[model samples]
Target: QPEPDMITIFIGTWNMGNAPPPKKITSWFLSKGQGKTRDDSADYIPHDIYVIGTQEDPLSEKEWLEILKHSLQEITSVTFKTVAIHTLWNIRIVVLAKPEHENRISHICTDNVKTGIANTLGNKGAVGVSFMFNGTSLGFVNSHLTSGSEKKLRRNQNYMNILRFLALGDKKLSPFNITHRFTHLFWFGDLNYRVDLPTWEAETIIQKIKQQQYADLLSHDQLLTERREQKVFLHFEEEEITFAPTYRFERLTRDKYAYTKQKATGMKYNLPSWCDRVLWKSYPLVHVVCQSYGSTSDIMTSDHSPVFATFEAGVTSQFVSKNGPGTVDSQGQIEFLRCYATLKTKSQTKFYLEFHSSCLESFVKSQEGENEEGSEGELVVKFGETLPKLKPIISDPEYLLDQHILISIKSSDSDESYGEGCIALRLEATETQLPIYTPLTHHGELTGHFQGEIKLQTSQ
Candidate 1:
């Protein structure tokens, strides 16, 4: 079998409009098409893509949602595919698959995914992906640096975060086979930087990789005197050659950068500046070419340029996962659930049983609420100088007896998977003012429709 000539991947700030309407799934149901959406007849399909590091601007989320949903609606009609993870914020990271084996693609991320490159900082940072293919593993991360404060430093930290995320334990996003020999470990995006020569070290690691020994693949198979000698893509050969101008002060499509008000005037850099870029895994990217595929900013979409990188896939493997895939066969239902429950119980060593002694009938009362100020069930004992920290978990006993404190998964609240199901355990406060209600409210269903409560008692 002949090897695939190339597998092209697009990574950039793909504007689907503004705020897309929130829907049942994490992403829009529509198949977002590839190409200048405005061009009714122009349909171009690149192999796959990862659209990441976006900003919530000009368009309200509601407006953008409609457009994104519609754009995807068109794409799905064709053989292309996409998976997107929402960061709880308006921004998102979308990974697209091609027609041939698009169905095999699956996405696994976190619902409580943290913000910033590292979660502790609480900044909207970066999103990443790790995939195994053709006896090899590949990891890619899309990033958008801090917008308001310490923008540059945060951007540098973004790279550091990538390093940490990729190097998470010796297993590194493991469970999949790792790769060597032309293997890829890429982290690129609209870094709000135009790192030409694909080298910008805001931090030591990046600097070590960039300005230092870190290798970025170019048109050269071997380091040559002239850059053009080993070029991969044909576009570089075109006239009026460009290296920068992906953003403001670079490629000026229009003299006016403002959309409506003056606040956005200076913000738009009409000149072509290479603020967007692509960094490689190592020195000679065997058969990869990364370059800008024109700008999406002109369509009144985003302010950044979209980039495309095309790499040739091997004949039999075709840049595919060599481990094939994983599947589990049917087996007898052991007491796995029970064992899991027990393990969970044991792991929660810090957790303990506490009784809100006042509410004794909470078990019998399937539904109860009070409008009275202080009469509202259990108040989350908040923390401050006078209180201990509070973290609570709800668990239901399997059976409940008169004096034995028998409890179990609620039979009445049987529909465990619907709406926001909850388990009620006794609450407690040890070191700080344990805000039981705070964790309970956020941890369980907050609304009245899916409300649940725990029956507490002094373990007699």
Candidate 2:
């Protein structure tokens, strides 16, 4: 009778949980679309994937586990380790959304593992995600822009760079575009654009990408209704003291910590201020609420409170900030070492590791009961015979132990005729059974060793 809606997700936003952030964290969310949840309502379910994003933990192992359990995800093809990139100084967090109906939509992508660019005004930069739904797909960018004047320009330029990459770039190390913009886009996340002034400084770049078409999700229609109900939820981001400024800076210091305060005048009271947000684009959205306890304690986690939303498409998500409970150490400050030392959250000790079998007969099983490689859509197959050795476990960390003969792999990687990049195999270990099929990996070229990589159970 009607087209059924197929998915919903919850997003949380946290901060630098690292002393030295890595190009990409080795945690759960490591690739785009790879969603992991340890609870069915608690993780360890199918339809999960990983995405390369940041995750930070301010709470202790016990505290984090509780919150992580409350957290959830929905994805496809990729995975989200589901926490901020925690190192030794900062923390972070995010949404683990479910995308059961992603096929129904188009134009969704995220850039959370980008690092080493060398032009960020200050600390690390922010990431972005784009997606489509109900015939409407839009680019969603999640960023934590730089602050102050000198860095301001850098931040603006960085955002533009992101736009350029999204519009025409590709690949992880060297972005190049294989697709064009067929849908709308929104630059979501803590833009760090001042609430007191216009975010127009980024206008030129925005216009370059034809960004005027997008709007802010906070101003959506539904939020207007809820604002009246939750008076405290007056998400006035620009008010001086009434709503703490999303950012704080020392009179003149580059310390990532040391938060300079802001005060209010007139209608706004004198306090920190509301600084977190979700800037948008072509697609329409509904805002439910953006809330945080006055301090990290009240909120129990995250430097900034959760900026949540309730969508008409029935999609719900939250930005669980990185400042959480028990994150403080002996000094009552956020430290990564202590966080890890006391790391909580149920360990996903088991992995959904999969790799493609070079054995051609297996490819035939993918389609008809048995088919020929040269036969139309069918690939060549011979029985349990050896294939090529293009894809190899080149040089992975000793930590990614338990190298099993995963079910899925990159036979295509071994098909080095018309060269292309190999697939990124993401492996995770949980305390439960692995998802039906996972370990996002594919076999590709390796010094002409495509066959070398398929030495089934070589460790044995």
Candidate 3:
């Protein structure tokens, strides 16, 4: 049985070789052996999230997206919504999720990196989409690397470029490196890493695949070799290949490898390789289990077969109250107050303020707010100006009205006490005037004034 916090995800990758999708391409997503078949004899499992990546995609963005949506909806009864979709010339990535999970998904972001022609062209590059599902952050990248058997070095460079240049959110705030930003990251598409052996020799070894023997064939796999050398795809994990290679199949022909002269290199044959692949990485202690991984040869419109994997991705579970607001349990309820205050001093000196209350539970600072500490809680205040609006969590909202909070003002440069005051926390929305200013006393004499107000609410 699936755990409460676990979601099943389906990831698929294919290289279309600039060919248009066939009219009936449902096999790419629903064919058997591409993932764990249902015990009820179903061909595929209905995953919660579906991430599909394509290289050398020929159709326009709108056409491709519509086709995918229509085909997926036809295969399953559940309504899937597009969470994120992005295309970088020939490379594209689309993320779709069930509509039931719409409220729990957030922080959706998309970005791309160019690695072709002086690192400015999109012909060979990557497109990424990232989102937060409940409490788990996930990132998906679809990349197309340099092709050819000897361009493994360039492919490695492309991988590094994607990792270093792809920024998902705001450039200044999120910065670079999508790898470290997410809890689980998936990188897939046409990596284009070929076999190290010559065409004729590779053919002989590939023939051993008929006997279910891949030892000699996989020994010369470029991607595997590069990964073993720690030169590329560092810390990424790919499922064991129980299926045949997914590349260099004859166009519109099933179960036949392409063997033809190349216009660019004049090679006799394009060595069959696992160019289309799916790999994933998760942060330490985060559980992500690959349930099944395989490729489908039923669809032969393109020269490369599609590869897919199913994963049971673990997420942080959240508690939802079934009862309405009136039935909410008050013992452990948390209330929040957005407090604002202004401080005025006679000396016109730069100063900060501290807020202390016996009922203060915790202070939630704004993302751009500066750091300042207090014995009971923290607040940011600019003398002669309104305080940075603060949201402080209160443990007991009803009992807070009878208590008093102490506010102290001090010089920012010298740390010397300017003045102190005690304000009553009895400001009800209907009972009190707005912006009440209270006089601050120093050495038993009035020295300054402090103005404050608070709006109360409950935390969801």
Candidate 2 C-alpha error for residue 92, in Å: 7.1
In terms of lDDT, the best-performing candidate is 3
For model 2, the local distance difference test gives 0.28
Q: Which residue ranges in model 1 land beyond 4 Å of their true spot?
A: 1-6, 14-53, 57-79, 84-88, 103-123, 133-136, 147-153, 166-182, 194-253, 257-273, 282-285, 291-293, 301-460
The C-alpha TM-scores of every prediction are 0.41, 0.34, 0.66
Q: Pick out the ten consecutive residues of candidate 3 with the lowest summed lDDT.
A: 362-371
Q: Which scores greater on lDDT, model 2 or model 3? A: 3
Candidate 2 lDDT tens digits, 62-103: 444333433322322233343222221122333233344444
Please state the error at residue 216 of candidate 1 in Å.
Answer: 22
How accurate locally, in lDDT, is each candidate? 0.31, 0.28, 0.67
- Full candidate order by TM-score, most accurate first: 3, 1, 2
Candidate 3 error regions (>4 Å): 1-4, 31-45, 119-122, 169-176, 264-269, 318-460
Q: Which candidate do you rate higher for TM-score, 1 or 3? A: 3
**Cα lDDT for residue 333, candidate 1:** 9
lDDT of 3 by residue, 127-156 (tens): 999887865678999999888777899998
